[PDB]
Ligand binder design. Sequence first.
Ligand SMILES: O=C(O)CCC(=O)C(=O)O
Ligand SMILES: O=C(O)CCC(=O)C(=O)O
Ligand SMILES: [Fe+2]
Ligand SMILES: [Fe+2]
Lengths: 335, 335
Amino acid sequence: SGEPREEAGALGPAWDESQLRSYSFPTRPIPRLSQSDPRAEELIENEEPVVLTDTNLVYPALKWDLEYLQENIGNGDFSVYSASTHKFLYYDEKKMANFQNFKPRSNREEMKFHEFVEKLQDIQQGEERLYLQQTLNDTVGRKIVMDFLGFNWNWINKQQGKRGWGQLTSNLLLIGMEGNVTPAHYDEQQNFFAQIKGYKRCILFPPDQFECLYPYPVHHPCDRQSQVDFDNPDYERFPNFQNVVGYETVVGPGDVLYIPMYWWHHIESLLNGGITITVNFWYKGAPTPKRIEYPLKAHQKVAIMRNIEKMLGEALGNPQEVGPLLNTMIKGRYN
Amino acid sequence: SGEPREEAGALGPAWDESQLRSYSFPTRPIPRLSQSDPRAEELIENEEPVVLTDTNLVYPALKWDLEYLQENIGNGDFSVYSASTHKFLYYDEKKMANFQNFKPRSNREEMKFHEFVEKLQDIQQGEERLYLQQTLNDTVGRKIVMDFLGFNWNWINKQQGKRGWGQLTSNLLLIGMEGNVTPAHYDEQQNFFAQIKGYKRCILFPPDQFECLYPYPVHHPCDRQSQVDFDNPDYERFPNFQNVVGYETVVGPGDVLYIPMYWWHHIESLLNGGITITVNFWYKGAPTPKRIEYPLKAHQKVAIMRNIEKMLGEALGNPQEVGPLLNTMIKGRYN
Ligand SMILES: O=C(O)CCC(=O)C(=O)O
Ligand SMILES: O=C(O)CCC(=O)C(=O)O
Ligand SMILES: [Fe+2]
Ligand SMILES: [Fe+2]
């Protein structure tokens, strides 16, 4: 992760190790570079993570905080997630019909910002934890729309153009509480993670560690999430979690982390670090080349495995038979 | 800026986008309200811009044009500014002694109105551009003095009384040519911008965008002006110009724009819109409250920075050392 950076103005260290959680695997630091540095462009083009420290991407939002937001964001509805533990168990509603025994571990709920601020206030007066996650569309107040327009769209748009990425699928505003943890998972789109308030420790695993992270079945509501409990790894069920090695960093106000598509990421708001605020940017990856180019990269093999699982689930007319058939194919033949 | 307003009498649109220049930043419309509307009074009291459409402030001047003026204004002298480009580079004479390498980019020149009208005529027979700017004192013809007396002094005086503003520092008559551009800058006084003939696009930036507009050093002849070339922004020298968001409008005959003190403003006479005529009104802001009131507003912090720069320039007995000392104070200590 690297030594805690010293804040300007002789203010103490931004954070200290005691705020970071302990895990069973090793890690090395993700590079912190300047957007002008040729090495940063090199990392992004090769689809490797990099923390850009001077993009000014969300510059107008650095002043944001709960008071400012509540007052100017408006009186619309915001999706607030809640959990009893620190780990926020998110899931896919549409895939619940496939796994009837799946009991929910986290509940969402629309509410007004001022309500979230209040509901958050008394919880600080507690084991419960909330996590607000909502898109930054025009639906919001005029002032917030001005700040939004003030983002460095010149930088990010140029970045989108040279990488060949597709459309910006969405912008997500995230406000969480200290200690909050979003378990490891991967997304299929390219992502620029812009930190605004507070610090978050981000642990990333490359796509080739698929075999050590044991993702749920594609048809399961937790598709794309790791089945391993990072706080208590079951080595009998997931032996290869003992070989996992990750890339880590702690991002703070002004930092932008590039999370390449298909890369795993574990995110946590530093303990006793106050609330955190982040805005993420999603872009569809560049279209896959017409003619295949070998040797296939790891993320491409992951795409293929996802496709096989999907096709099989439809061909058998039932996602619950996917596993049995796969075992039938493999046992005594390929294993 | 808003859709071009349709002129009365089924005359086409007042103007069309093709007449507006293209810039790298986003903008939203300044409210166009009636002076009777409570929202307008609310905007002015909170020191936010607003275009009042029915003040009748300069009603008698709406008939004005070059012929009428030349004939009745008199045979006195008028300060005419000239430039080779469209951007009029104005400067402070008194501060030239501090920056000897500063070469002038625009020249002033007293001349008689009929001469200005003539000099303007052949230029339309060209890259040169002129801009007449002179005060409306009794020095002028009897007829122009009658029109002047006919301004709605009842409205503006009442406005001056309720806002607590100081004396009317001056009245400026402005006559320019289509395409003319006055680069972004801020004034320290409150201003009512009364449009009389033609249309002008006005782009304003609030005081809190100080960090994105990079004003010249206080001792520089271009003090209060932005160092950024809006037509070709140097993002390496002024990275934060990528985060600038402005408030825009196009004022025409009869409109009065309130430009709050310390607010930045970029003004341009619509392309192929003919000459433009404007009269501005300057008032010293209301005296700063005896006991400070936190949290300080942005314009107050700008006042403080200007004061520090001024004091430092005198304390070191030389304005050229201000920068070196500021860097010495900051480097490795606050940055
Ligand atoms: O910040 C977080 O807690 C989660 C971020 C995340 O999963 C994402 O941006 O995809
Ligand atoms: O109309 C213009 O070109 C400039 C107006 C201006 O700068 C002012 O009224 O202070
Ligand atoms: Fe994610
Ligand atoms: Fe001005």
